[PDB]
Write a protein that binds this ligand. Sequence first.
Ligand SMILES: [Ca+2]
Length: 297
Amino acid sequence: SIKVECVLRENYRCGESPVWEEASQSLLFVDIPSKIICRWDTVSNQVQRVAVDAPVSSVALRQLGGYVATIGTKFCALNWENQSVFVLAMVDEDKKNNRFNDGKVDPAGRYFAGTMAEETAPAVLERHQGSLYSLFPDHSVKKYFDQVDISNGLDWSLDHKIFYYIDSLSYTVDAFDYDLQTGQISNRRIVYKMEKDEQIPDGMCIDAEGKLWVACYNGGRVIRLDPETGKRLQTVKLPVDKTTSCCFGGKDYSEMYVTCARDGLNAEGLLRQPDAGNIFKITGLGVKGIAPYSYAG
Ligand SMILES: [Ca+2]
């Protein structure tokens, strides 16, 4: 029996980048325009926040300790004890109004993250201004490809030979051959085409059977896809339309956490979606995900 439950009611403006930290039994995430990195201890049920000085679009675990995040167009390191945040590297220095969007750590500890032009409204922005980058463990930055509208959801196959990637405004999930030892990619192809009512593909995670779960922004749902066949396997709807991302968490990665937004909703929309901006948990899916990788620098 699938169960969808609103488990944290903090009314974020745009919750994003959920990441499960098993060591602390906490959910890490960001609220982008609110310029906070959040850590929700699911045991004490208490949320701690680190304020930052620009929109923060993603957060990831740092292997050596603490966290890393994408703030503005900067990869940054966070020490939680002192709330110290410092720049590791900067990208898009020749772009006037870009920011990072979604990011995630690859199986070799590289922090992949892509950028976008800054929006004036959801999906209203200068086109093709972003690029996909990765921050290597030695703190150097690799630039992969440009002409990205809105860099979004991403993950890697379990055999670590394929990289899955969403540019939201292409309305497709794409795949690349990916080399674990070097972090190179190539041979880009479409592996799923979004249907009209699935709206905008946003965040994404892989499950333990190699299927992809995609949060559908404006679509009020997550969908499960088979990248090998190009077919949707499952849909699970939520009572909020602006579902932004998803990850697996809890014991044995058997629960799914879903972030969502209230930004962009009109007065009627807010009333119809009282839990807009909150964190949801989905149980009873019948698959487990995998642990996130930690950044190795
Ligand atoms: Ca996103």
